[PDB]
Amino acid sequence: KKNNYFYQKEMLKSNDIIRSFKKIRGYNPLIRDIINKLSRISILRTQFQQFNSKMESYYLNCIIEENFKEMTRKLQRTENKSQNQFDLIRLNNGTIELNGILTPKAEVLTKIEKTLNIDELESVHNTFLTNILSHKLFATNTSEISVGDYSGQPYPTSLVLLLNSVYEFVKVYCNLNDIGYEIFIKMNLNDHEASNGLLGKFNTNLKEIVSQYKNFKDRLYIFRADLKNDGDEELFLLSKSLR
Amino acid sequence: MGGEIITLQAGQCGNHVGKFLWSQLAKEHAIGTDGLSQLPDSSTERDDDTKPFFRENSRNKFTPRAIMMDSEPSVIADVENTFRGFFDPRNTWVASDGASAGNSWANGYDIGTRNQDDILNKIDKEIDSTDNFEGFQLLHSVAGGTGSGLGSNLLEALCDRYPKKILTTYSVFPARSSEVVVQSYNTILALRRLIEDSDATVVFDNASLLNISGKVFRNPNIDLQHTNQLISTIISSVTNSIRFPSYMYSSMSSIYSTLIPSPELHFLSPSFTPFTSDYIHDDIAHKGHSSYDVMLDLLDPSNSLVSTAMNNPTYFNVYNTIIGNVEPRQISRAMTKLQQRIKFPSWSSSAMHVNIGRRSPYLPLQPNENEVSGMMLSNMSTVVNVFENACNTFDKVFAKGAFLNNYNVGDLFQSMQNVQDEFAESREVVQSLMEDYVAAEQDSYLDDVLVDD
Amino acid sequence: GEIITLQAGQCGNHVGKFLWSQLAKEHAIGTDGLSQLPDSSTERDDDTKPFFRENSRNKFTPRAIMMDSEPSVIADVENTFRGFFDPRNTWVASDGASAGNSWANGYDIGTRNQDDILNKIDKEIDSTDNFEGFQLLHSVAGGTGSGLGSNLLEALCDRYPKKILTTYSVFPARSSEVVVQSYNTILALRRLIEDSDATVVFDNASLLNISGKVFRNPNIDLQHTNQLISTIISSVTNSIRFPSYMYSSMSSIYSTLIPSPELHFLSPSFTPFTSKGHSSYDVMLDLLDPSNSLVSTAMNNPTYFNVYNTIIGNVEPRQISRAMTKLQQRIKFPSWSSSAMHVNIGRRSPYLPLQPNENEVSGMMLSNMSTVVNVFENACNTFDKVFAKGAFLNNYNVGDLFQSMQNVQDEFAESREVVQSLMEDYVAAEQDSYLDDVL
Amino acid sequence: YDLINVLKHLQQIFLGYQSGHNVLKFLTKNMGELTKHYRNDNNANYDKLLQNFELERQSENPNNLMRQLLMIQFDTETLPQVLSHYLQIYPAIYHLKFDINIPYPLNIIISRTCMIKYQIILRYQLVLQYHSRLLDETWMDLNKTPSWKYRGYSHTVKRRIVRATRVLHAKMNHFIKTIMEYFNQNVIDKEVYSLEKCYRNPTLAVAIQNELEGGLTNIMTNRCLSDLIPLQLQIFDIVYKFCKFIKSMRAKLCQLDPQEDAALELIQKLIEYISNASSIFRKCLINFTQELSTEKFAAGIERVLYSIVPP
Ligand SMILES: Nc1nc2c(ncn2[C@@H]2O[C@H](COP(=O)(O)OP(=O)(O)OP(=O)(O)O)[C@@H](O)[C@H]2O)c(=O)[nH]1
Ligand SMILES: Nc1nc2c(ncn2[C@@H]2O[C@H](COP(=O)(O)OP(=O)(O)OP(=O)(O)O)[C@@H](O)[C@H]2O)c(=O)[nH]1
Structure with missing residues (x-):
């Protein structure tokens, strides 16, 4: 939420400053390329924020799916039961076992609600929490998880690295927006007669943003290759959508 | 990041679309036509949220945060008589200026600039009546000259009155125009201000509207009320993400963030x-x-x-x-x-x-x-063809200067040369918009920053 | 594995309606398309997937498209089977009733409105995943039907070179219209030799004779002939619709029946x-x-x-x-x-x-x-006689065939040449010297 | 417990009774995976095949307990290898198998020897259906490829190569499909009919199990299968050579379609290759005919003989 709020703040600041340029630009022939570069950096920031929001929405979708499976099948187990009277156990070798005895199909020679009490509810809540924790993308710094190929870092570690990179991107975008506001004030003061140092700072910040975007694209391609080579269909679909 | 949105009904078609949208929202939230919510005020547990669109004066009444502005008082009186107590009589603007003297954009711009004080005072009152605000939703109705002028004046006021708010506009485009020259002039003069100040713009071409109204409905005759009902349903569906707050999109700004890549590309x-x-919705279960x-x-x-x-x-x-x-x-x-x-x-x-x-x-x-x-x-970028039809009409008629005796009155320019220069500037700005669109259609748009940093 | 039925002409529409009614009565689908079977037992041994698409309402829409220049028969079929067929799978060319019993007008209508048929078949293919080929049912006597069949055959062979096409061609009987119908018959036969993969022949005279023999009323109806076509199609597709151990696809049947593509008439x-x-x-x-x-x-x-x-x-x-x-x-x-x-x-x-x-x-x-070669020889002889004796075929043409009558005569001569080569190959395979090149 | 439904499900799974469509769809979906696993070593990852199998099992109706409990696995030995290990006969292909974990109290009736018999029968039927699918795919390619159905430019090689290969494929079909029909009619169908008619007013579950084991023993000891395995081991290699020759001819036809003597030399090499292959296959068929005539088995045998004798 901090990343998303910072992205939205930068977006509204850039939108307001561009609206101010469009209002009091007049003719301004020397600002056309600067506005084009600002729009390009805004598009890059928009792609960054779209990736961040896509990751956040995927995580929230998994969370809400777990919550729905907990409410419909655990909190409301006695209401609209799953009817799966067969209890199976899956092992690491792909073997399936039947848990306990096999009850008959309700056939007794004949010639209320199954609600959960205090301890059962507490245990099912604990199992729901453990199922939430056991996600591969949330299993941070664990020995059971496998690192991504050609990277040597786990998936949560690479996600934390991507978060740090997009936070640095947000910070350098805030710096670029401050430089742009200073250039805007200088243009309000004089008509393209000063602010050469501010223009140089803007150019250097744009180059830094471009280099950071290239590095982030390389890291994202590496993460995509990792998701494709992991084998999970969810990671495959996520990589395909990000690509 | 979620804020309230105030509706701006402008022109006859705009007022009809706003009335249909408010009736649809009342039907959805069980509010009804009488203004008083059909549901009892004791059931405060509501999954939806009428606060961004309905001001709650009493526990059972929800006045819609909307303002209607039109030069024809007949449609406003009809809407107020149909929706007894639903709409706010203080949010109805007519200025007692009588019927519109033609379908020129200059007439609407003049009637906006003259009574700009009253509409701005009403907007300030509606803003003070609430606390959290995000932006307005304007119904331009570019097919009508007076409505387009009023919308352009409202936009030119709001852009520098509230620069911290995001503005969305809905421009209804006709299929076949009777006065093609005047309607193209009005649409181009409206698109000028849309490119200048409007943050988001959604177009509605009447050809596909009539096609859908002839396909899904049984009656061959098409009526403007159930024609605007389609745009009403569209607006209700796009505002559903804020009315019934979802888990991913819950604000107009968050919705438009993934839809507006740049302020130049603001046409969807x-x-x-x-x-x-809609009315004839029985033929859907087959x-x-x-x-x-x-x-x-x-x-x-x-x-x-x-x-x-x-x-x-x-x-x-x-x-x-x-x-x-x-x-x-x-x-x-x-x-x-x-x-x-x-x-x-x-x-x-x-x-x-x-x-x-x-x-x-x-x-x-x-x-x-x-x-x-x-x-x-x-x-x-398919809207560039809808705009290219109008710009080709402009290029084929502007060589002579027809219908120049209508756009000269009302506006701040009474001479022919000033109106000609304004029309030429609007043609130039829409040409630059089309060029930007056809350039973004290519890969060189992103390569412009890659070739030089 | 999924096969799409193609009903060309009024005869094709009739035989398709009869076949779909028979399949509905067999698989308990009825006229309304809804599953007439109880929802308590889902275990079934048949296979309705390649012929019926099941929607969320458990209704089975037949995977068939009707291409005909006469919307009257299509409207009659729709009225008789309201709630069975999909209105989107209907193609009437938006040209009104039929006009002209020549292959030229049919092929011209097909080439003009091929985009609609192409979009329809593309949507029908994309609706599912497993596809094997197409199924056509028509009569070579009808000019519009033969033209539409040739057009769709050309489209299929130049669009999907991997899908197998099977057709059921009803030859005309010994009648009076054969002086002009033989042209369409030999044109469709040339198209079958060129691009078609499998064809099942039917003789209208023998069909009417068997009809009069099995029925009590000698006044045999075209509806009765279409019902017999329905019965024979159901009997030949039972192996695919109820696969148990050996036969589960028409590919193996055509592999064990058709030895070479030059002999693909059954x-x-x-x-x-x-x-x-x-x-x-x-x-x-x-x-x-x-x-x-x-x-x-x-x-x-x-x-x-x-x-x-x-x-x-x-x-x-x-x-x-x-x-x-x-x-x-x-x-x-x-x-x-x-x-x-x-x-x-x-x-x-x-x-x-x-x-x-x-x-x-x-x-x-x-x-x-050697039973189909007799009908082929009779048809080609009648065509040769009428062509070499009367030059009347150059008066009823459309489009390119009407722009110049010499190209029509050249195309008919080429059709005669290819059917002559076909019958020569058949009579050579009849002899032992056919495989002498390897022994 | 619905023993009738249980036996129907096991006949559908292992015996292919009224379930040929499902196994044919599985084979057509996993053509490349199966052949790549058979051509590669044990290091080849079968995770994709396992995912396909598990998604097919999930899409299958959950009411079918046998199909929902069906598990897949890989054996380090081939089908002829396990046949020579289990019987007194002599032998990296067909390393796949399936298994059912019979629970309580159904395990006291369905033992593990009948499970192994079911696995062997299922592997044999899978081999037969895979070879039939390969033949059908070869025929479909030959009949649908324009590079194959195109001729002219004074070929003089059409009736020599394409006609010879089509006759060879027709003979292979009239052999394989004929023996498959004979089997599925005079062994599989008869055993299914007996297993369906035995439980009519039953008296002893142990007697039903003994009848089932006796039927499986008759299926395994039928002299047609024991005589075919030493010949099928070569017929499969002949089919492999035939389809690889078909692939090479398909890859060469697009280049042969129109100028040098090298092309004529390659055509001569191809025709002599395929003629030697056809002669070797004819000699092998004559040897198989001699073997089956020496074997003391006869309606289906006479049908197979009439199908395999050359004109
Ligand atoms: N589709 C549709 N178009 C409308 C509707 N109402 C008005 N219009 C448009 O309005 C045009 C006719 O002019 P008017 O309706 O009088 O609009 P105006 O000239 O600006 O007058 P006012 O709207 O009262 O300011 C037509 O070309 C329509 O495109 C409507 O309900 N549906
Ligand atoms: N057996 C049978 N043949 C039919 C039937 N309907 C049409 N035919 C065929 O159609 C031929 C006569 O020509 P038409 O019926 O006019 O068919 P067409 O020439 O294609 O004209 P349209 O069907 O209107 O396009 C006959 O020789 C039949 O082979 C039918 O219901 N049963």
């Missing part, structure tokens, strides 16, 4: 499956469609509300909102099928976006064939 | 049926007898190349072996091809109402022999 194209809340078929219909050109003219259309931001019991596996299947069928730019790796909303617990439940509906919004 | 037969009493030995004897074939044999001892029979009913192996020995003794095979005789036991549909003459095991048989 809508599409919707066969509706279910299609037997799923969410995948709904996505296919959304991506089909026959369900778009604007003239597609798809000649390898270049997409920039495609977004969809599905309301009903949606399946994630079916959504994934539809996405996999559409990513191999939708043309995507080689310079942008952004794909289509999917959002799932919630259905109203008080709306009439539909059978399992059409219980799930969908809306699609695509950033397509 | 003659069907089916006996006994109405529209225990006969043992399987008697059923196969009647199948061998020419009085039960759906095509005019006109041959004392045809040269059998490949035969394949499907027996529907409870059978025992001793009668099968006896009839197999009798068939090996009677039927003559060439000294260069194999004397293969394939028998497939097809299961009966438990969801189908009991056909009259219960417990009577029946049998269908597809043959590749």
